[PDB]
Amino acid sequence: PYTIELIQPEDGEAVIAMLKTFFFKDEPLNTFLDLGECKELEKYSLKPLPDNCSYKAVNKKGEIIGVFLNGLMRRPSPDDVPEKAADSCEHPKFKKILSLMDHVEEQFNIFDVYPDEELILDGKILSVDTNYRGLGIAGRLTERAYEYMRENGINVYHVLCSSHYSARVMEKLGFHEVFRMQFADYKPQGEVVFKPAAPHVGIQVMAKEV
C-alpha cells in the first residue's frame, strides 16, 4: 500500500517528525541512557540527507511511513586523520553515543576489507511506522539503494547496527556481519558505559557486496 521515493531537501521536517514518533525512543542506546529527544540527536540524524541517496516509503495520503537514511563514504586519503564526532558535542548523554561510534571506527576499517572500492554506501537509519510493518518496506527501501549503487559504481552497502533488531532485518536481506563490539567489552575509562536490555548485546556492522 505504498510507494518508494527519493527523500528531498524539502522533506527534512517530515523525516524528523517521523523519527520522533517511531525511531528515537525505541533505540536501545537511547533507551538505556533515558535520552529521549534532543536537538543534537536530531541534527546528527539528518546529516546524510544532502547526499541525495536516502529513500522514503509513502502511503496513499502522501505520509512518510518508512525511511532508510544513507550517506556516501569516500575512501579517506593517504594522509587522513578521522574526525571525532564526540569532540564537537555538548550534550553529555548524546556524547556517550558518539564516543562509542568513534571507538567503533578506530577498531574497524571497512575500507581495508574491500581494497578495490573507493566509495561505499553507508546505511545510517532504518525505521518503519508500526502500522505498516510486515509488508516488505525494509526490503523495498534496500532494493532502491541497490539501484542507486549500480548507477554510481558502488558495490558495497555498509550498515552499522546498534539494535539487534536492525541487524536481524539486514541479515534476512542477505547482509553479513563483518564486525562486532560487545557492550560488556566497551570500557573506555575502565568501566562499562552501556548495558541495554537483552537481546541488545553489541554493535554489529553488517555489509553486503552487490
PDB file of all heavy atoms in Angstrom, residues 101-138:
ATOM      1  N   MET A 101      30.479   5.423  18.740  1.00  0.00           N
ATOM      2  CA  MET A 101      30.629   5.412  17.290  1.00  0.00           C
ATOM      3  C   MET A 101      32.075   5.701  16.872  1.00  0.00           C
ATOM      4  O   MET A 101      32.597   5.042  15.976  1.00  0.00           O
ATOM      5  CB  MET A 101      29.672   6.411  16.631  1.00  0.00           C
ATOM      6  CG  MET A 101      28.203   6.093  16.860  1.00  0.00           C
ATOM      7  SD  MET A 101      27.763   4.426  16.319  1.00  0.00           S
ATOM      8  CE  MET A 101      26.910   3.796  17.768  1.00  0.00           C
ATOM      9  N   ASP A 102      32.711   6.685  17.509  1.00  0.00           N
ATOM     10  CA  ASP A 102      34.116   6.997  17.207  1.00  0.00           C
ATOM     11  C   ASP A 102      35.007   5.782  17.484  1.00  0.00           C
ATOM     12  O   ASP A 102      35.920   5.469  16.718  1.00  0.00           O
ATOM     13  CB  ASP A 102      34.627   8.199  18.026  1.00  0.00           C
ATOM     14  CG  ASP A 102      34.027   9.547  17.576  1.00  0.00           C
ATOM     15  OD1 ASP A 102      33.548   9.663  16.430  1.00  0.00           O
ATOM     16  OD2 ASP A 102      34.052  10.510  18.374  1.00  0.00           O
ATOM     17  N   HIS A 103      34.733   5.106  18.591  1.00  0.00           N
ATOM     18  CA  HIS A 103      35.520   3.947  19.019  1.00  0.00           C
ATOM     19  C   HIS A 103      35.406   2.801  18.019  1.00  0.00           C
ATOM     20  O   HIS A 103      36.401   2.154  17.683  1.00  0.00           O
ATOM     21  CB  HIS A 103      35.047   3.490  20.401  1.00  0.00           C
ATOM     22  CG  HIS A 103      35.707   2.234  20.888  1.00  0.00           C
ATOM     23  ND1 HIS A 103      36.973   2.220  21.424  1.00  0.00           N
ATOM     24  CD2 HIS A 103      35.264   0.957  20.933  1.00  0.00           C
ATOM     25  CE1 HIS A 103      37.287   0.984  21.780  1.00  0.00           C
ATOM     26  NE2 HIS A 103      36.260   0.198  21.490  1.00  0.00           N
ATOM     27  N   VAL A 104      34.186   2.562  17.536  1.00  0.00           N
ATOM     28  CA  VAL A 104      33.954   1.546  16.517  1.00  0.00           C
ATOM     29  C   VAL A 104      34.788   1.836  15.267  1.00  0.00           C
ATOM     30  O   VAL A 104      35.413   0.936  14.720  1.00  0.00           O
ATOM     31  CB  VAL A 104      32.439   1.405  16.170  1.00  0.00           C
ATOM     32  CG1 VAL A 104      32.236   0.533  14.949  1.00  0.00           C
ATOM     33  CG2 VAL A 104      31.685   0.809  17.352  1.00  0.00           C
ATOM     34  N   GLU A 105      34.807   3.095  14.830  1.00  0.00           N
ATOM     35  CA  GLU A 105      35.605   3.457  13.650  1.00  0.00           C
ATOM     36  C   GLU A 105      37.103   3.215  13.851  1.00  0.00           C
ATOM     37  O   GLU A 105      37.829   2.868  12.906  1.00  0.00           O
ATOM     38  CB  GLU A 105      35.367   4.914  13.244  1.00  0.00           C
ATOM     39  CG  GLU A 105      36.211   5.353  12.055  1.00  0.00           C
ATOM     40  CD  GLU A 105      35.769   6.687  11.475  1.00  0.00           C
ATOM     41  OE1 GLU A 105      34.824   7.300  12.019  1.00  0.00           O
ATOM     42  OE2 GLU A 105      36.367   7.120  10.467  1.00  0.00           O
ATOM     43  N   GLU A 106      37.579   3.408  15.076  1.00  0.00           N
ATOM     44  CA  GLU A 106      39.007   3.237  15.324  1.00  0.00           C
ATOM     45  C   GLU A 106      39.380   1.770  15.495  1.00  0.00           C
ATOM     46  O   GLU A 106      40.551   1.410  15.421  1.00  0.00           O
ATOM     47  CB  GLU A 106      39.477   4.080  16.514  1.00  0.00           C
ATOM     48  CG  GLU A 106      38.996   3.607  17.867  1.00  0.00           C
ATOM     49  CD  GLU A 106      39.479   4.505  18.989  1.00  0.00           C
ATOM     50  OE1 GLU A 106      39.888   5.649  18.698  1.00  0.00           O
ATOM     51  OE2 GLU A 106      39.456   4.064  20.158  1.00  0.00           O
ATOM     52  N   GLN A 107      38.381   0.919  15.705  1.00  0.00           N
ATOM     53  CA  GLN A 107      38.632  -0.507  15.890  1.00  0.00           C
ATOM     54  C   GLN A 107      38.397  -1.322  14.615  1.00  0.00           C
ATOM     55  O   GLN A 107      38.872  -2.452  14.501  1.00  0.00           O
ATOM     56  CB  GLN A 107      37.759  -1.062  17.022  1.00  0.00           C
ATOM     57  CG  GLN A 107      38.106  -0.507  18.385  1.00  0.00           C
ATOM     58  CD  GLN A 107      39.429  -1.044  18.901  1.00  0.00           C
ATOM     59  OE1 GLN A 107      39.708  -2.237  18.798  1.00  0.00           O
ATOM     60  NE2 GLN A 107      40.255  -0.161  19.441  1.00  0.00           N
ATOM     61  N   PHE A 108      37.647  -0.763  13.672  1.00  0.00           N
ATOM     62  CA  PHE A 108      37.313  -1.489  12.451  1.00  0.00           C
ATOM     63  C   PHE A 108      37.213  -0.547  11.256  1.00  0.00           C
ATOM     64  O   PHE A 108      36.433   0.410  11.284  1.00  0.00           O
ATOM     65  CB  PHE A 108      35.988  -2.250  12.619  1.00  0.00           C
ATOM     66  CG  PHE A 108      35.497  -2.894  11.349  1.00  0.00           C
ATOM     67  CD1 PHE A 108      36.112  -4.039  10.861  1.00  0.00           C
ATOM     68  CD2 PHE A 108      34.419  -2.352  10.641  1.00  0.00           C
ATOM     69  CE1 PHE A 108      35.677  -4.631   9.691  1.00  0.00           C
ATOM     70  CE2 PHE A 108      33.972  -2.943   9.470  1.00  0.00           C
ATOM     71  CZ  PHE A 108      34.594  -4.094   8.999  1.00  0.00           C
ATOM     72  N   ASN A 109      38.006  -0.828  10.219  1.00  0.00           N
ATOM     73  CA  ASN A 109      38.015  -0.048   8.984  1.00  0.00           C
ATOM     74  C   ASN A 109      37.463  -0.850   7.816  1.00  0.00           C
ATOM     75  O   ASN A 109      38.152  -1.713   7.267  1.00  0.00           O
ATOM     76  CB  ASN A 109      39.442   0.382   8.644  1.00  0.00           C
ATOM     77  CG  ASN A 109      39.501   1.372   7.482  1.00  0.00           C
ATOM     78  OD1 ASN A 109      38.513   1.579   6.770  1.00  0.00           O
ATOM     79  ND2 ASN A 109      40.658   1.983   7.286  1.00  0.00           N
ATOM     80  N   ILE A 110      36.232  -0.550   7.419  1.00  0.00           N
ATOM     81  CA  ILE A 110      35.573  -1.287   6.344  1.00  0.00           C
ATOM     82  C   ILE A 110      36.318  -1.179   5.009  1.00  0.00           C
ATOM     83  O   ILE A 110      36.228  -2.075   4.172  1.00  0.00           O
ATOM     84  CB  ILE A 110      34.135  -0.784   6.140  1.00  0.00           C
ATOM     85  CG1 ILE A 110      33.388  -1.671   5.143  1.00  0.00           C
ATOM     86  CG2 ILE A 110      34.163   0.674   5.652  1.00  0.00           C
ATOM     87  CD1 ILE A 110      33.043  -3.056   5.658  1.00  0.00           C
ATOM     88  N   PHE A 111      37.051  -0.089   4.805  1.00  0.00           N
ATOM     89  CA  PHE A 111      37.764   0.098   3.543  1.00  0.00           C
ATOM     90  C   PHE A 111      38.974  -0.828   3.381  1.00  0.00           C
ATOM     91  O   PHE A 111      39.452  -1.032   2.258  1.00  0.00           O
ATOM     92  CB  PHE A 111      38.187   1.558   3.352  1.00  0.00           C
ATOM     93  CG  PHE A 111      37.103   2.423   2.773  1.00  0.00           C
ATOM     94  CD1 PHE A 111      36.422   3.328   3.563  1.00  0.00           C
ATOM     95  CD2 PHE A 111      36.758   2.312   1.437  1.00  0.00           C
ATOM     96  CE1 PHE A 111      35.418   4.122   3.028  1.00  0.00           C
ATOM     97  CE2 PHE A 111      35.748   3.115   0.894  1.00  0.00           C
ATOM     98  CZ  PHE A 111      35.083   4.009   1.697  1.00  0.00           C
ATOM     99  N   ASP A 112      39.482  -1.359   4.491  1.00  0.00           N
ATOM    100  CA  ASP A 112      40.568  -2.341   4.434  1.00  0.00           C
ATOM    101  C   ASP A 112      40.050  -3.707   3.987  1.00  0.00           C
ATOM    102  O   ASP A 112      40.775  -4.487   3.369  1.00  0.00           O
ATOM    103  CB  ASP A 112      41.292  -2.478   5.782  1.00  0.00           C
ATOM    104  CG  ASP A 112      42.032  -1.215   6.184  1.00  0.00           C
ATOM    105  OD1 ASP A 112      42.484  -0.464   5.293  1.00  0.00           O
ATOM    106  OD2 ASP A 112      42.163  -0.973   7.400  1.00  0.00           O
ATOM    107  N   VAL A 113      38.789  -3.985   4.299  1.00  0.00           N
ATOM    108  CA  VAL A 113      38.150  -5.220   3.864  1.00  0.00           C
ATOM    109  C   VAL A 113      37.969  -5.278   2.356  1.00  0.00           C
ATOM    110  O   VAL A 113      38.089  -6.350   1.762  1.00  0.00           O
ATOM    111  CB  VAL A 113      36.776  -5.440   4.560  1.00  0.00           C
ATOM    112  CG1 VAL A 113      36.161  -6.778   4.122  1.00  0.00           C
ATOM    113  CG2 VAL A 113      36.928  -5.394   6.062  1.00  0.00           C
ATOM    114  N   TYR A 114      37.686  -4.121   1.744  1.00  0.00           N
ATOM    115  CA  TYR A 114      37.385  -4.035   0.314  1.00  0.00           C
ATOM    116  C   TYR A 114      38.347  -3.088  -0.379  1.00  0.00           C
ATOM    117  O   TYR A 114      38.007  -1.940  -0.648  1.00  0.00           O
ATOM    118  CB  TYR A 114      35.951  -3.530   0.107  1.00  0.00           C
ATOM    119  CG  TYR A 114      34.938  -4.482   0.672  1.00  0.00           C
ATOM    120  CD1 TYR A 114      34.390  -4.279   1.930  1.00  0.00           C
ATOM    121  CD2 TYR A 114      34.546  -5.603  -0.042  1.00  0.00           C
ATOM    122  CE1 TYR A 114      33.470  -5.168   2.456  1.00  0.00           C
ATOM    123  CE2 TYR A 114      33.623  -6.487   0.469  1.00  0.00           C
ATOM    124  CZ  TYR A 114      33.093  -6.271   1.719  1.00  0.00           C
ATOM    125  OH  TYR A 114      32.168  -7.162   2.218  1.00  0.00           O
ATOM    126  N   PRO A 115      39.570  -3.559  -0.638  1.00  0.00           N
ATOM    127  CA  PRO A 115      40.608  -2.700  -1.211  1.00  0.00           C
ATOM    128  C   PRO A 115      40.245  -2.175  -2.598  1.00  0.00           C
ATOM    129  O   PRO A 115      40.782  -1.149  -3.000  1.00  0.00           O
ATOM    130  CB  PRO A 115      41.844  -3.617  -1.264  1.00  0.00           C
ATOM    131  CG  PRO A 115      41.308  -5.013  -1.160  1.00  0.00           C
ATOM    132  CD  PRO A 115      40.076  -4.900  -0.297  1.00  0.00           C
ATOM    133  N   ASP A 116      39.357  -2.859  -3.312  1.00  0.00           N
ATOM    134  CA  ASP A 116      39.019  -2.461  -4.675  1.00  0.00           C
ATOM    135  C   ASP A 116      37.993  -1.323  -4.727  1.00  0.00           C
ATOM    136  O   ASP A 116      37.626  -0.884  -5.806  1.00  0.00           O
ATOM    137  CB  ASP A 116      38.474  -3.653  -5.464  1.00  0.00           C
ATOM    138  CG  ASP A 116      39.556  -4.428  -6.175  1.00  0.00           C
ATOM    139  OD1 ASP A 116      40.395  -3.802  -6.854  1.00  0.00           O
ATOM    140  OD2 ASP A 116      39.561  -5.670  -6.055  1.00  0.00           O
ATOM    141  N   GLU A 117      37.536  -0.852  -3.565  1.00  0.00           N
ATOM    142  CA  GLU A 117      36.444   0.128  -3.511  1.00  0.00           C
ATOM    143  C   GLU A 117      36.917   1.521  -3.081  1.00  0.00           C
ATOM    144  O   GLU A 117      37.770   1.646  -2.206  1.00  0.00           O
ATOM    145  CB  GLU A 117      35.334  -0.370  -2.579  1.00  0.00           C
ATOM    146  CG  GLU A 117      34.931  -1.817  -2.812  1.00  0.00           C
ATOM    147  CD  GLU A 117      34.334  -2.038  -4.192  1.00  0.00           C
ATOM    148  OE1 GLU A 117      33.643  -1.128  -4.692  1.00  0.00           O
ATOM    149  OE2 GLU A 117      34.564  -3.113  -4.787  1.00  0.00           O
ATOM    150  N   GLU A 118      36.379   2.559  -3.726  1.00  0.00           N
ATOM    151  CA  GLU A 118      36.704   3.954  -3.406  1.00  0.00           C
ATOM    152  C   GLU A 118      35.515   4.691  -2.804  1.00  0.00           C
ATOM    153  O   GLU A 118      35.661   5.784  -2.256  1.00  0.00           O
ATOM    154  CB  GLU A 118      37.150   4.706  -4.666  1.00  0.00           C
ATOM    155  CG  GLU A 118      38.552   4.324  -5.139  1.00  0.00           C
ATOM    156  CD  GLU A 118      39.648   4.820  -4.203  1.00  0.00           C
ATOM    157  OE1 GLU A 118      39.747   6.047  -3.984  1.00  0.00           O
ATOM    158  OE2 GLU A 118      40.414   3.981  -3.683  1.00  0.00           O
ATOM    159  N   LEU A 119      34.339   4.092  -2.925  1.00  0.00           N
ATOM    160  CA  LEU A 119      33.101   4.706  -2.467  1.00  0.00           C
ATOM    161  C   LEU A 119      32.172   3.609  -1.961  1.00  0.00           C
ATOM    162  O   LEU A 119      31.928   2.632  -2.658  1.00  0.00           O
ATOM    163  CB  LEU A 119      32.421   5.458  -3.620  1.00  0.00           C
ATOM    164  CG  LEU A 119      31.103   6.164  -3.326  1.00  0.00           C
ATOM    165  CD1 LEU A 119      31.278   7.210  -2.226  1.00  0.00           C
ATOM    166  CD2 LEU A 119      30.539   6.806  -4.599  1.00  0.00           C
ATOM    167  N   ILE A 120      31.654   3.784  -0.754  1.00  0.00           N
ATOM    168  CA  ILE A 120      30.756   2.808  -0.145  1.00  0.00           C
ATOM    169  C   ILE A 120      29.489   3.509   0.334  1.00  0.00           C
ATOM    170  O   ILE A 120      29.561   4.640   0.797  1.00  0.00           O
ATOM    171  CB  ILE A 120      31.440   2.114   1.038  1.00  0.00           C
ATOM    172  CG1 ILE A 120      32.592   1.256   0.525  1.00  0.00           C
ATOM    173  CG2 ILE A 120      30.432   1.251   1.833  1.00  0.00           C
ATOM    174  CD1 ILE A 120      33.432   0.603   1.636  1.00  0.00           C
ATOM    175  N   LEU A 121      28.339   2.848   0.220  1.00  0.00           N
ATOM    176  CA  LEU A 121      27.074   3.450   0.680  1.00  0.00           C
ATOM    177  C   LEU A 121      26.895   3.096   2.146  1.00  0.00           C
ATOM    178  O   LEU A 121      27.028   1.934   2.513  1.00  0.00           O
ATOM    179  CB  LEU A 121      25.885   2.924  -0.116  1.00  0.00           C
ATOM    180  CG  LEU A 121      24.535   3.607   0.158  1.00  0.00           C
ATOM    181  CD1 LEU A 121      24.562   5.079  -0.236  1.00  0.00           C
ATOM    182  CD2 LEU A 121      23.398   2.892  -0.562  1.00  0.00           C
ATOM    183  N   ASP A 122      26.603   4.089   2.982  1.00  0.00           N
ATOM    184  CA  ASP A 122      26.514   3.869   4.432  1.00  0.00           C
ATOM    185  C   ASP A 122      25.065   3.998   4.918  1.00  0.00           C
ATOM    186  O   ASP A 122      24.511   5.096   4.961  1.00  0.00           O
ATOM    187  CB  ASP A 122      27.452   4.859   5.144  1.00  0.00           C
ATOM    188  CG  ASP A 122      27.503   4.677   6.660  1.00  0.00           C
ATOM    189  OD1 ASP A 122      27.105   3.614   7.170  1.00  0.00           O
ATOM    190  OD2 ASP A 122      27.963   5.622   7.348  1.00  0.00           O
ATOM    191  N   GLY A 123      24.446   2.870   5.270  1.00  0.00           N
ATOM    192  CA  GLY A 123      23.063   2.881   5.720  1.00  0.00           C
ATOM    193  C   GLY A 123      22.987   3.274   7.181  1.00  0.00           C
ATOM    194  O   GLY A 123      23.448   2.534   8.046  1.00  0.00           O
ATOM    195  N   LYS A 124      22.400   4.432   7.463  1.00  0.00           N
ATOM    196  CA  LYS A 124      22.507   5.017   8.799  1.00  0.00           C
ATOM    197  C   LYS A 124      21.299   4.782   9.707  1.00  0.00           C
ATOM    198  O   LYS A 124      21.455   4.418  10.878  1.00  0.00           O
ATOM    199  CB  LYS A 124      22.812   6.512   8.695  1.00  0.00           C
ATOM    200  CG  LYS A 124      24.249   6.790   8.246  1.00  0.00           C
ATOM    201  CD  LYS A 124      24.536   8.266   8.089  1.00  0.00           C
ATOM    202  CE  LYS A 124      26.003   8.495   7.771  1.00  0.00           C
ATOM    203  NZ  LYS A 124      26.878   7.978   8.860  1.00  0.00           N
ATOM    204  N   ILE A 125      20.102   5.008   9.179  1.00  0.00           N
ATOM    205  CA  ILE A 125      18.879   4.838   9.967  1.00  0.00           C
ATOM    206  C   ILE A 125      17.804   4.164   9.131  1.00  0.00           C
ATOM    207  O   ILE A 125      17.473   4.638   8.044  1.00  0.00           O
ATOM    208  CB  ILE A 125      18.326   6.201  10.457  1.00  0.00           C
ATOM    209  CG1 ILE A 125      19.243   6.816  11.510  1.00  0.00           C
ATOM    210  CG2 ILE A 125      16.910   6.047  11.043  1.00  0.00           C
ATOM    211  CD1 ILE A 125      18.832   8.224  11.910  1.00  0.00           C
ATOM    212  N   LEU A 126      17.266   3.057   9.641  1.00  0.00           N
ATOM    213  CA  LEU A 126      16.151   2.378   9.014  1.00  0.00           C
ATOM    214  C   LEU A 126      15.003   2.376  10.018  1.00  0.00           C
ATOM    215  O   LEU A 126      15.153   1.883  11.143  1.00  0.00           O
ATOM    216  CB  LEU A 126      16.527   0.940   8.644  1.00  0.00           C
ATOM    217  CG  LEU A 126      15.356   0.035   8.258  1.00  0.00           C
ATOM    218  CD1 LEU A 126      14.798   0.445   6.888  1.00  0.00           C
ATOM    219  CD2 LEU A 126      15.725  -1.457   8.289  1.00  0.00           C
ATOM    220  N   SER A 127      13.869   2.950   9.635  1.00  0.00           N
ATOM    221  CA  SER A 127      12.731   2.977  10.545  1.00  0.00           C
ATOM    222  C   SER A 127      11.429   2.830   9.776  1.00  0.00           C
ATOM    223  O   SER A 127      11.272   3.403   8.702  1.00  0.00           O
ATOM    224  CB  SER A 127      12.729   4.272  11.345  1.00  0.00           C
ATOM    225  OG  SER A 127      11.670   4.307  12.281  1.00  0.00           O
ATOM    226  N   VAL A 128      10.506   2.039  10.323  1.00  0.00           N
ATOM    227  CA  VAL A 128       9.198   1.856   9.706  1.00  0.00           C
ATOM    228  C   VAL A 128       8.064   2.047  10.723  1.00  0.00           C
ATOM    229  O   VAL A 128       8.090   1.505  11.831  1.00  0.00           O
ATOM    230  CB  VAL A 128       9.074   0.463   9.028  1.00  0.00           C
ATOM    231  CG1 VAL A 128       7.658   0.245   8.421  1.00  0.00           C
ATOM    232  CG2 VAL A 128      10.146   0.273   7.987  1.00  0.00           C
ATOM    233  N   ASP A 129       7.084   2.845  10.326  1.00  0.00           N
ATOM    234  CA  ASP A 129       5.836   3.034  11.064  1.00  0.00           C
ATOM    235  C   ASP A 129       5.195   1.686  11.380  1.00  0.00           C
ATOM    236  O   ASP A 129       4.936   0.896  10.486  1.00  0.00           O
ATOM    237  CB  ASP A 129       4.905   3.869  10.181  1.00  0.00           C
ATOM    238  CG  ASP A 129       3.599   4.226  10.850  1.00  0.00           C
ATOM    239  OD1 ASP A 129       3.035   3.392  11.588  1.00  0.00           O
ATOM    240  OD2 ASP A 129       3.128   5.361  10.606  1.00  0.00           O
ATOM    241  N   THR A 130       4.945   1.443  12.668  1.00  0.00           N
ATOM    242  CA  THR A 130       4.354   0.194  13.151  1.00  0.00           C
ATOM    243  C   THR A 130       3.138  -0.265  12.353  1.00  0.00           C
ATOM    244  O   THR A 130       2.943  -1.460  12.118  1.00  0.00           O
ATOM    245  CB  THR A 130       3.921   0.336  14.621  1.00  0.00           C
ATOM    246  OG1 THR A 130       5.024   0.820  15.392  1.00  0.00           O
ATOM    247  CG2 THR A 130       3.452  -1.009  15.182  1.00  0.00           C
ATOM    248  N   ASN A 131       2.308   0.691  11.951  1.00  0.00           N
ATOM    249  CA  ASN A 131       1.102   0.378  11.211  1.00  0.00           C
ATOM    250  C   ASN A 131       1.363  -0.169   9.820  1.00  0.00           C
ATOM    251  O   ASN A 131       0.449  -0.664   9.175  1.00  0.00           O
ATOM    252  CB  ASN A 131       0.207   1.620  11.099  1.00  0.00           C
ATOM    253  CG  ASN A 131      -0.107   2.224  12.447  1.00  0.00           C
ATOM    254  OD1 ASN A 131      -0.999   1.754  13.147  1.00  0.00           O
ATOM    255  ND2 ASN A 131       0.643   3.257  12.832  1.00  0.00           N
ATOM    256  N   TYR A 132       2.601  -0.057   9.347  1.00  0.00           N
ATOM    257  CA  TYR A 132       2.934  -0.514   8.007  1.00  0.00           C
ATOM    258  C   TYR A 132       4.029  -1.575   7.994  1.00  0.00           C
ATOM    259  O   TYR A 132       4.583  -1.873   6.939  1.00  0.00           O
ATOM    260  CB  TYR A 132       3.356   0.671   7.135  1.00  0.00           C
ATOM    261  CG  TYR A 132       2.248   1.672   6.965  1.00  0.00           C
ATOM    262  CD1 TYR A 132       2.002   2.628   7.937  1.00  0.00           C
ATOM    263  CD2 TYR A 132       1.429   1.634   5.848  1.00  0.00           C
ATOM    264  CE1 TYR A 132       0.965   3.547   7.784  1.00  0.00           C
ATOM    265  CE2 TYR A 132       0.395   2.539   5.686  1.00  0.00           C
ATOM    266  CZ  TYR A 132       0.168   3.492   6.654  1.00  0.00           C
ATOM    267  OH  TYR A 132      -0.871   4.388   6.474  1.00  0.00           O
ATOM    268  N   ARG A 133       4.355  -2.127   9.160  1.00  0.00           N
ATOM    269  CA  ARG A 133       5.366  -3.178   9.228  1.00  0.00           C
ATOM    270  C   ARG A 133       4.804  -4.500   8.715  1.00  0.00           C
ATOM    271  O   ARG A 133       3.586  -4.736   8.741  1.00  0.00           O
ATOM    272  CB  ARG A 133       5.898  -3.341  10.656  1.00  0.00           C
ATOM    273  CG  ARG A 133       6.762  -2.181  11.121  1.00  0.00           C
ATOM    274  CD  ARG A 133       7.118  -2.310  12.597  1.00  0.00           C
ATOM    275  NE  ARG A 133       7.801  -1.118  13.078  1.00  0.00           N
ATOM    276  CZ  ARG A 133       8.162  -0.903  14.337  1.00  0.00           C
ATOM    277  NH1 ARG A 133       7.916  -1.813  15.265  1.00  0.00           N
ATOM    278  NH2 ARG A 133       8.781   0.226  14.661  1.00  0.00           N
ATOM    279  N   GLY A 134       5.695  -5.360   8.232  1.00  0.00           N
ATOM    280  CA  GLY A 134       5.298  -6.693   7.813  1.00  0.00           C
ATOM    281  C   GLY A 134       4.880  -6.757   6.369  1.00  0.00           C
ATOM    282  O   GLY A 134       4.388  -7.788   5.901  1.00  0.00           O
ATOM    283  N   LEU A 135       5.079  -5.649   5.652  1.00  0.00           N
ATOM    284  CA  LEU A 135       4.638  -5.555   4.269  1.00  0.00           C
ATOM    285  C   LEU A 135       5.819  -5.422   3.304  1.00  0.00           C
ATOM    286  O   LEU A 135       5.626  -5.106   2.128  1.00  0.00           O
ATOM    287  CB  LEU A 135       3.690  -4.369   4.090  1.00  0.00           C
ATOM    288  CG  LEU A 135       2.463  -4.237   5.005  1.00  0.00           C
ATOM    289  CD1 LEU A 135       1.760  -2.878   4.818  1.00  0.00           C
ATOM    290  CD2 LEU A 135       1.468  -5.360   4.771  1.00  0.00           C
ATOM    291  N   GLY A 136       7.031  -5.664   3.811  1.00  0.00           N
ATOM    292  CA  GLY A 136       8.231  -5.673   2.990  1.00  0.00           C
ATOM    293  C   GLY A 136       8.894  -4.332   2.721  1.00  0.00           C
ATOM    294  O   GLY A 136       9.735  -4.217   1.830  1.00  0.00           O
ATOM    295  N   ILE A 137       8.545  -3.317   3.496  1.00  0.00           N
ATOM    296  CA  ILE A 137       9.075  -1.984   3.241  1.00  0.00           C
ATOM    297  C   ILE A 137      10.606  -1.927   3.374  1.00  0.00           C
ATOM    298  O   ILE A 137      11.279  -1.322   2.550  1.00  0.00           O
ATOM    299  CB  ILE A 137       8.406  -0.929   4.138  1.00  0.00           C
ATOM    300  CG1 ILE A 137       6.946  -0.731   3.719  1.00  0.00           C
ATOM    301  CG2 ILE A 137       9.144   0.382   4.064  1.00  0.00           C
ATOM    302  CD1 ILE A 137       6.158   0.145   4.654  1.00  0.00           C
ATOM    303  N   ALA A 138      11.164  -2.548   4.401  1.00  0.00           N
ATOM    304  CA  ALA A 138      12.611  -2.506   4.566  1.00  0.00           C
ATOM    305  C   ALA A 138      13.315  -3.087   3.340  1.00  0.00           C
ATOM    306  O   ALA A 138      14.328  -2.555   2.883  1.00  0.00           O
ATOM    307  CB  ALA A 138      13.040  -3.230   5.854  1.00  0.00           C
TER     308      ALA A 138
END
